[PDB]
Enzyme design. Structure first.
Site, short mmCIF file in Angstrom:
data_model
loop_
_atom_site.label_atom_id
_atom_site.label_comp_id
_atom_site.label_asym_id
_atom_site.label_seq_id
_atom_site.Cartn_x
_atom_site.Cartn_y
_atom_site.Cartn_z
N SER A 100 1.28 0.74 -2.96
CA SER A 100 1.60 0.65 -1.56
C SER A 100 1.00 -0.46 -0.82
O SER A 100 1.46 -1.12 0.18
CB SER A 100 1.17 1.93 -0.65
OG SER A 100 1.82 3.14 -0.68
C1 LIG Z 1 1.59 3.85 -1.87
O1 LIG Z 1 1.21 3.53 -3.01
C2 LIG Z 1 2.42 5.16 -1.86
N1 LIG Z 1 2.19 5.98 -3.17
C3 LIG Z 1 3.03 6.87 -3.46
O2 LIG Z 1 3.63 7.50 -2.67
C4 LIG Z 1 3.40 7.14 -4.70
C5 LIG Z 1 2.82 6.27 -5.95
C6 LIG Z 1 2.98 6.88 -7.26
C7 LIG Z 1 3.48 8.25 -7.39
C8 LIG Z 1 3.75 9.16 -6.48
C9 LIG Z 1 3.52 8.79 -5.00
C10 LIG Z 1 4.00 9.85 -3.96
C11 LIG Z 1 3.10 9.84 -3.01
C12 LIG Z 1 3.02 10.97 -1.97
C13 LIG Z 1 4.26 11.72 -2.05
C14 LIG Z 1 5.16 11.70 -3.01
C15 LIG Z 1 5.07 10.49 -3.97
C16 LIG Z 1 6.15 10.70 -5.23
O3 LIG Z 1 6.63 9.18 -5.31
O4 LIG Z 1 6.36 11.56 -5.62
C17 LIG Z 1 2.71 5.78 -0.52
N2 LIG Z 1 1.44 5.34 0.06
C18 LIG Z 1 0.14 6.20 0.04
C19 LIG Z 1 -1.08 5.27 0.59
O5 LIG Z 1 -2.46 5.89 0.28
O6 LIG Z 1 -1.06 4.78 1.44
C20 LIG Z 1 0.55 7.47 0.33
C21 LIG Z 1 -0.16 8.38 -0.62
C22 LIG Z 1 0.41 7.72 1.49
S1 LIG Z 1 2.39 7.54 -0.32
#
Ligand SMILES: *C(=O)[C@@H](NC(=O)c1ccccc1-c1ccccc1C(=O)O)[C@@H]1N[C@@H](C(=O)O)C(C)(C)S1
Length: 252
Positions: free
Chosen positions: A58
């Site tokens: 992200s």
């Molecule tokens: C940013 O990197 C981002 N990442 C992801 O959402 C992410 C990345 C890899 C695998 C799974 C996921 C994910 C996270 C939360 C919910 C669902 C999923 C999914 O795809 O199943 C977004 N940003 C992050 C941050 O740290 O800012 C976050 C955790 C808020 S989500």
């Protein structure tokens, strides 16, 4: 992918200072990098680890926002996007967004809609000009999310500093709009800007980031924390960054 896709080996021709922030990192593994504008100097905990390239996750939304601004996909009057009714597991994602809300809440779909409108040749040109990590766009889908594109912790700082501080191709109004979306904290002493990233692989955290900058009355500092092991989440990388920045005197 290639022999050089996992490391950054270009020498720092600058002055640099080795740090020991192992007590703050604790049971987590990774690196911290900071650059001071006034000092023109880097400060690095775990230099070897700071040159290993990892998916930006992200944190790449910094660049997607700038690209979306540069290509007039979003602007200063209207960066609003409507929700397409796809149910997400976070209520903050299940509604209309603008650049501010999307950045604050890390709304993947907003940035994905931006990326869908950006032609591959433009991205390739920009990653080249920016020197963005391995510049590997792979299949060009969500290429920044645990995929082909990788960047080191040291590069996160150099690339972000250069993008914002050089008189380049991006307008000042785009830079200002991005900055506004990244603002986390403001008081009498400082403004703290930044963005988290969290990778999840097979249900486990694997790759945490917090990349940003601090403006004080005396200086401006770009910084990044990467976590590769322990509890490697964006949330934890942010906590670690704040503890380190505080100790270094950047936050007062
Ligand atoms: C940013 O990197 C981002 N990442 C992801 O959402 C992410 C990345 C890899 C695998 C799974 C996921 C994910 C996270 C939360 C919910 C669902 C999923 C999914 O795809 O199943 C977004 N940003 C992050 C941050 O740290 O800012 C976050 C955790 C808020 S989500």
């Amino acid at each position: 992918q290639s022999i050089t896709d996992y490391n950054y080996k270009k020498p720092l021709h600058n002055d640099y200072q080795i740090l020991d922030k192992s007590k703050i990192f604790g049971s987590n593994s990774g690196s911290f990098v900071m650059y001071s504008m006034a000092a023109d100097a880097y400060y690095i905990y775990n230099e070897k680890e700071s040159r290993k390239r990892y998916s930006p996750n992200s944190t790449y939304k910094i660049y997607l926002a700038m690209f979306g601004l540069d290509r007039h996909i979003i602007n200063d009057e209207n960066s609003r996007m409507s929700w397409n009714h796809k149910h997400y597991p976070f209520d903050a994602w299940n509604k209309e967004q603008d650049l501010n809300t999307a950045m604050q809440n890390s709304v993947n779909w907003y940035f994905e809609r931006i990326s869908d409108q950006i032609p591959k040749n433009y991205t390739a040109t920009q990653l080249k000009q920016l020197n963005y990590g391995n510049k590997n766009l792979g299949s060009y889908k969500s290429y920044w999310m645990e995929d082909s594109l990788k960047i080191s912790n040291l590069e996160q700082v150099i690339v972000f500093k250069n993008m914002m501080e050089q008189n380049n191709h991006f307008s000042k109004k785009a830079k200002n709009q991005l900055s506004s979306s990244l603002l986390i904290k403001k008081n009498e002493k400082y403004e703290l800007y930044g963005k988290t990233g969290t990778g999840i692989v097979n249900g486990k955290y694997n790759n945490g980031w917090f990349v940003g900058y601090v403006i004080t009355n005396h200086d401006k500092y770009y910084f990044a924390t990467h976590l590769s092991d322990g509890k490697p989440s964006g949330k934890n990388a942010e906590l670690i960054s704040e503890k380190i920045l505080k100790e270094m005197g950047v936050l007062n």
